[PDB]
Design a protein around this ligand. Structure first.
Ligand SMILES: [Ca+2]
Ligand SMILES: [Ca+2]
Ligand SMILES: [Cl-]
Length: 196
């Protein structure tokens, strides 16, 4: 809850958060129009583009989730709720540290989080329900990401919690609770998965 709770911002183009800015929604809900349908199609725009060092906080992203939130690194995404994930909820598009802290995501047909560049990706105090995967390192990429899942609770994970084809990436978990998931991690070695 914040001072904008009960308000909805209807957008027709991606919100760009410039480097060094924190976009604080104060509880506002964002609904994108003409930017996608939230399907898995690749002809959608992101709701948000966070330049390097931009932060986002306290927004609810309504359906359609479109192409979610494009992060160009060193971003904090705090108390963001994806009421219905689109193609994906958030994508790391450039190198850096990206932290998703608080909030939740719901109804991701595929992945919630998509890692397309080397990064440290931390998901903290987050719940997700009805998802295909929580985190996917871009398919067949072999750069390194380090994933931290800390105080993450997942419900109904169709594929796996996290998948990477990189032999060098790592996944660190601490209080990761997973209900209804056949396979936790799909990495080249279980030695890349660590508890802390
Ligand atoms: Ca995407
Ligand atoms: Ca969805
Ligand atoms: Cl990318």
């Amino acid at each position: 809850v914040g001072t904008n709770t009960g308000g909805v911002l209807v957008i027709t183009d991606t919100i760009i958060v410039k480097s060094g800015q924190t976009y604080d929604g104060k509880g506002i809900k964002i609904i994108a129009q003409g930017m996608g349908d939230g399907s898995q199609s690749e002809n959608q725009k992101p709701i948000f583009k966070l330049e390097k060092g931009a932060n986002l906080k306290n927004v609810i992203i309504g359906a359609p989730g479109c192409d979610g939130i494009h992060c160009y690194g060193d971003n904090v995404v705090e108390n963001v709720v994806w009421e219905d994930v689109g193609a994906d909820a958030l994508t790391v598009k450039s190198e850096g540290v990206v932290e998703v802290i608080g909030g939740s995501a719901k109804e991701a047909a595929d992945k919630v989080f998509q890692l397309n560049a080397p990064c440290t990706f931390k998901v903290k105090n987050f719940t997700a329900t009805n998802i295909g995967k929580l985190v996917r390192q871009n398919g067949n990429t072999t750069f390194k990401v380090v994933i931290y899942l800390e105080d993450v609770t997942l419900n109904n994970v169709k594929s796996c919690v996290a998948k990477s084809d990189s032999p060098v990436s790592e996944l660190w978990y601490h209080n990761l609770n997973v209900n209804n998931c056949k396979t936790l991690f799909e990495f080249p070695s279980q030695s890349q998965i660590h508890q802390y």
